[PDB]
Design an enzyme around this catalytic site. Structure first.
Site, mmCIF file in Angstrom:
data_model
loop_
_atom_site.group_PDB
_atom_site.id
_atom_site.type_symbol
_atom_site.label_atom_id
_atom_site.label_comp_id
_atom_site.label_asym_id
_atom_site.label_seq_id
_atom_site.Cartn_x
_atom_site.Cartn_y
_atom_site.Cartn_z
ATOM 1 N N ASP A 93 40.232 31.884 33.652
ATOM 2 C CA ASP A 93 40.309 30.604 34.613
ATOM 3 C C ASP A 93 38.538 29.676 34.542
ATOM 4 O O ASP A 93 38.342 29.535 35.412
ATOM 5 C CB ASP A 93 40.654 31.074 35.589
ATOM 6 C CG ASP A 93 41.029 30.175 36.696
ATOM 7 O OD1 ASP A 93 41.272 29.244 36.014
ATOM 8 O OD2 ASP A 93 41.459 30.354 38.225
ATOM 9 N N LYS A 160 38.456 48.585 43.004
ATOM 10 C CA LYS A 160 39.640 49.706 43.904
ATOM 11 C C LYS A 160 40.205 48.641 45.093
ATOM 12 O O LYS A 160 41.177 49.544 45.396
ATOM 13 C CB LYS A 160 39.108 50.402 44.193
ATOM 14 C CG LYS A 160 37.773 51.513 43.549
ATOM 15 C CD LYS A 160 36.179 52.091 43.762
ATOM 16 C CE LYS A 160 35.516 52.495 42.690
ATOM 17 N NZ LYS A 160 34.439 53.465 43.368
ATOM 18 N N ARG A 161 39.755 47.567 45.438
ATOM 19 C CA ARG A 161 40.429 46.528 46.598
ATOM 20 C C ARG A 161 41.725 46.018 45.444
ATOM 21 O O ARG A 161 42.544 45.565 46.256
ATOM 22 C CB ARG A 161 39.394 45.685 47.408
ATOM 23 C CG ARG A 161 38.437 46.622 47.357
ATOM 24 C CD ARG A 161 37.933 47.174 48.722
ATOM 25 N NE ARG A 161 36.630 47.658 48.422
ATOM 26 C CZ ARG A 161 35.706 48.249 49.587
ATOM 27 N NH1 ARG A 161 36.575 48.982 49.934
ATOM 28 N NH2 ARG A 161 35.063 48.362 49.371
ATOM 29 N N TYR A 162 41.274 46.317 44.834
ATOM 30 C CA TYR A 162 43.240 45.169 43.564
ATOM 31 C C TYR A 162 43.644 46.076 42.578
ATOM 32 O O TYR A 162 42.800 45.587 41.376
ATOM 33 C CB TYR A 162 42.129 44.009 42.499
ATOM 34 C CG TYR A 162 42.152 43.032 43.998
ATOM 35 C CD1 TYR A 162 42.740 42.609 44.478
ATOM 36 C CD2 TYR A 162 40.595 42.577 43.943
ATOM 37 C CE1 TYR A 162 42.817 41.132 45.322
ATOM 38 C CE2 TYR A 162 40.418 41.473 44.936
ATOM 39 C CZ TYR A 162 41.350 40.760 45.437
ATOM 40 O OH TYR A 162 41.059 40.048 46.825
ATOM 41 N N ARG A 163 44.069 47.418 42.371
ATOM 42 C CA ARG A 163 44.645 48.288 41.689
ATOM 43 C C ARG A 163 45.354 47.196 40.897
ATOM 44 O O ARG A 163 46.776 48.014 39.783
ATOM 45 C CB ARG A 163 44.800 49.240 42.422
ATOM 46 C CG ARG A 163 44.122 50.046 43.298
ATOM 47 C CD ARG A 163 45.528 49.856 45.025
ATOM 48 N NE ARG A 163 45.183 50.389 45.924
ATOM 49 C CZ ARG A 163 45.481 51.296 46.424
ATOM 50 N NH1 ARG A 163 46.765 50.849 46.495
ATOM 51 N NH2 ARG A 163 45.551 52.153 47.702
ATOM 52 N N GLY A 186 42.721 25.779 48.194
ATOM 53 C CA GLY A 186 41.965 24.023 47.844
ATOM 54 C C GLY A 186 40.633 24.565 47.628
ATOM 55 O O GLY A 186 39.918 22.904 46.893
ATOM 56 N N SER A 188 39.703 26.136 45.128
ATOM 57 C CA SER A 188 39.950 26.365 43.423
ATOM 58 C C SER A 188 38.855 25.599 42.770
ATOM 59 O O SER A 188 38.831 24.209 42.940
ATOM 60 C CB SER A 188 40.962 26.497 43.057
ATOM 61 O OG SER A 188 41.679 27.381 44.091
ATOM 62 N N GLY A 189 38.180 26.325 41.768
ATOM 63 C CA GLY A 189 37.599 25.496 40.623
ATOM 64 C C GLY A 189 36.403 24.933 40.894
ATOM 65 O O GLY A 189 35.753 24.403 40.124
#
Length: 236
Positions: A93, A160-163, A186, A188-189
């Protein structure tokens, strides 16, 4: 930005607001001045943007209401998106905007340095995220540029928070265990800026996250250090 405060004029001069004119003019995303005609931003911002012609890079802007019809902007000559980008959660990204003209550096508009390759064994502790994004998950876009201080969490800890996803070394995570402060839609980037020896660095690009400022759900950022070669190659 959730749980932030108002920025002052020229506090974050590398921050830009990125406008779209289709269907009508509005803030689309954040971005960072890194060179005289180069904005570093997130690729996911440009989904459904077909021509660089519908874009407007405004610099030195604190409040959105400063932008009037006669307020000048920088046209986007080229949108460069990383070949491997598919979507935010998969990585890559990252995107460059080559401006039609060069920015004339003033106090309210000027560039942020990238981290060094030898700066990979460096641990940033003074990090800030900035944008006109939502103050909460179900909000709108803010008039005043918001700022919030946030600590980085280790790639291992973030995973661990994002399996539900893969958290690669080309990503970097930042948040509070109990949440409350985070980037939101908003933002973002835009930049996550971390100060190292009196020099501000571009450590992350605002990419994604599960909701906004949720507890135990850190913000995910494109790890800029893992892309210096890519960026330098493109910025020529």
């Amino acid at each position: 930005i959730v749980g932030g405060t108002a920025s002052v004029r020229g506090e974050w001069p590398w921050q830009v607001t990125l406008h779209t004119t289709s269907p009508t003019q509005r803030h689309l995303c954040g971005g960072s001045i890194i060179g005289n005609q180069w904005i570093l931003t997130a690729a996911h911002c440009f989904y459904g943007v077909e021509s660089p012609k519908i874009l407007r890079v405004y610099s030195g802007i604190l409040q959105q209401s400063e932008i009037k019809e006669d307020t000048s902007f920088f046209g986007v000559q080229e949108i460069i998106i990383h070949d491997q980008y598919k979507m935010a959660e998969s990585g890559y990204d990252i995107a460059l905007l080559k401006l039609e003209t060069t920015v004339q550096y003033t106090d309210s508009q000027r560039p942020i340095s990238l981290p060094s390759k030898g700066d990979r064994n460096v641990i940033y502790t003074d990090c800030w995220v900035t944008g006109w994004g939502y103050r909460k998950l179900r909000d709108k876009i803010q008039n005043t540029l918001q700022k919030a201080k946030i600590p980085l969490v280790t790639n291992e800890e973030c995973q661990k928070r994002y399996r539900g996803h893969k958290i690669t070394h080309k990503m970097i995570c930042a948040g509070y265990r109990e949440g409350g402060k985070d980037a939101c839609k908003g933002d973002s980037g835009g930049p996550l800026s971390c100060k190292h020896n009196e020099v501000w660095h571009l450590v992350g690009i605002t990419s994604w996250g599960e909701g906004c400022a949720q507890r135990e759900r850190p913000g995910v950022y494109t790890n800029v250090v893992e892309y210096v070669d890519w960026i330098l190659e493109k910025t020529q």
